Design a protein around this ligand. Structure first.
Ligand SMILES: Cc1[nH]c(/C=C2\C(=O)Nc3ccc(C(=O)N[C@H](C)c4ccc(F)cc4)cc32)c(C)c1NC(=O)[C@@H](O)c1ccco1
Length: 503
């Protein structure tokens, strides 16, 4: 449902308006041709026009398909890539990958196959595109077109930008509505935080802490920040919308209570990947409980409510007794200096509760005081049933290890140690992260499961930073605004908006 005149709102500026952008945008190849979705497409599009560069994009694509190919069909896709790209006589022959790099790849196919066979060649390819092709793209009309998209990205975000619909959600410091971008017609979920309620509780450094964490993380399994803007009487965070309901509902209302182990394996795998993306920024979540794991329209999950997340300075530990009764790791209960370890404790709690249908330290049909629930977390060893395979028993107690030093995933290796645990033995993470594994439950689209101070002015300027680059560019692509607006002159000529002769 795009506005009647969304093409005027997203109308490209004339290339002469982007001079200040040209001389401020850092010219990092990985950023401009890969991380940024629209930059990636434009660079790939520039290579479509060159004969010699075309083959290098097709090969990288085919390697991406190989990485997610099943094992029994891996050596199959292996030679298919070889006979097309690594044969000296092929019309699509990769030349910059030296004869002394292909030759090894042949030997690797002569032996067993592995999902990272063409890793060496792929980097040889990227090292080439970094050189002359990238600097050519920088002087092409496609990079000028990229500067135009950046100009639009930078534009101010106001309340007009969106369209408030219904208040779907409620929490502390405000509410959560469902909004829509008028121009692109994409749905989001606002996080409307009342300004007069923040200054009172003085919780300004916690609102900026969450906003800064959300824009820096970009995970398929954590809610993503797309816009941050101020308004009269509120500060808003435009977040990923999740209509599938939370995991608590599905465990106890749709569950046995609980899920089959294989089904819990899927959610655990996606949550583990969520935490891994957070831990890449040395950021601890500290709030893992089922009601904070939401489901989308397809059945995949994201971690939500990062109000308790904090960015841990590297090589340092934090201190904070925060969270929810029953889901606080012992080191948090004791109010000790900890790191990322509470998140792996939480993961243990989640797997156990998904499988068993109740908390490991509080029976579903049990009435116990907070203090007894905590005593168990610190002294009592949880018990398992026949619902857990031996592998599931192992990961849970390894994750529920009282001493955070012997806890799974709390080593210098981190999340990789957990992905290797036999509980995920039948889980191909490459395919999971690529969204190729069908979720075990698909929600229905129609379903329904639910003052005039100056210091305050400086706090808003650091919060209302506007659109977030990667999510904004993805929005443009998803809604097909990019496909429709990214037009050039007929027959590979220069369009008028990119012509500096007549503006
Ligand atoms: C669509 C939809 N989104 C959400 C919530 C979020 C979402 O989407 N991203 C999010 C990202 C972060 C958060 C989040 O910080 N939270 C905590 C508790 C919170 C903190 C402060 C606050 F002030 C409000 C809430 C919440 C959401 C909800 C609650 C619903 N509502 C439903 O799912 C049901 O009505 C339904 C629709 C269809 C079927 O069932």
């Amino acid at each position: 449902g795009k506005s009647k005149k969304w093409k005027e709102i997203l109308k490209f500026p004339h290339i002469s308006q982007c001079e200040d952008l040209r001389r401020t945008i850092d010219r990092d190849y990985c950023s401009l041709c890969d991380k940024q979705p629209i930059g990636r497409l434009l660079f790939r599009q520039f290579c479509e026009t060159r004969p010699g560069l075309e083959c290098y994009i097709q090969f990288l694509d085919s390697v991406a398909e190989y990485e997610v190919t099943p094992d029994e069909k891996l050596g199959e896709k292996g030679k298919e890539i070889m006979t097309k790209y690594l044969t000296p006589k092929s019309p699509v022959f990769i030349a910059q990958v030296g004869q002394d790099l292909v030759s090894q790849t042949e030997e690797k196919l002569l032996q067993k196959p592995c999902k990272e066979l063409f890793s060496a060649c792929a980097q040889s390819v990227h090292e080439y595109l970094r050189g002359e092709p990238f600097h050519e793209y920088l002087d092409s009309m496609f990079f000028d077109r990229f500067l135009q998209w950046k100009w639009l990205e930078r534009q101010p975000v106001t309340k007009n930008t969106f369209r408030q619909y219904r208040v779907l959600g409620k929490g502390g410091f405000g509410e959560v509505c469902a909004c829509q971008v008028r121009a692109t017609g994409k749905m989001y979920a606002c996080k409307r935080l009342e300004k007069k309620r923040i200054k009172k509780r003085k919780g300004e450094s916690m609102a900026l802490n969450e906003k800064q964490i959300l824009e820096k993380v970009n995970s398929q399994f954590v809610v993503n920040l797309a816009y941050a803007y101020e308004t009269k009487d509120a500060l808003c965070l435009v977040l990923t919308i999740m209509n599938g309901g939370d995991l608590k509902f599905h465990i106890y209302n749709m569950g046995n209570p609980g899920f089959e182990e294989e089904r819990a394996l899927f959610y655990a795998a996606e949550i583990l990947c969520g935490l891994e993306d957070l831990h890449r920024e040395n950021t601890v979540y500290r709030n893992l409980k089922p009601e904070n794991i939401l489901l989308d329209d397809y059945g995949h999950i994201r971690i939500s409510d990062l109000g308790l997340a904090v960015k841990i300075p590297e090589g340092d530990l934090i201190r904070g007794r925060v969270g929810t009764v029953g889901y606080m790791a012992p080191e948090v209960l004791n109010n000790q200096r900890y790191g990322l370890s509470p998140d792996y404790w939480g993961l243990g709690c989640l797997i156990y509760e998904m499988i068993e249908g109740q908390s490991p330290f509080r029976g579903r049909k049990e009435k116990v005081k907070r203090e007894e629930v905590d005593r168990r977390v610190l002294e009592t060893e949880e018990v398992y049933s026949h619902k857990f395979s031996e592998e599931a028993k192992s990961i849970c107690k390894m994750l529920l290890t009282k001493d955070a030093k012997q806890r799974l995933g709390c080593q210098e290796e981190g999340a990789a140690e957990v992905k290797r645990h036999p509980f995920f033995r039948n889980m191909n993470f490459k395919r999971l992260e690529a969204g190729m594994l069908d979720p075990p439950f698909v929600p229905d689209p129609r379903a329904v499961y639910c003052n005039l101070d100056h210091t305050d002015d400086d706090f808003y300027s650091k919060f209302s930073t506007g659109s977030v680059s990667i999510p904004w560019q993805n929005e443009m692509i998803e809604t097909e605004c990019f496909k429709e607006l990214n037009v050039f002159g007929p027959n590979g000529t220069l369009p008028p908006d990119l012509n500096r002769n007549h503006p």
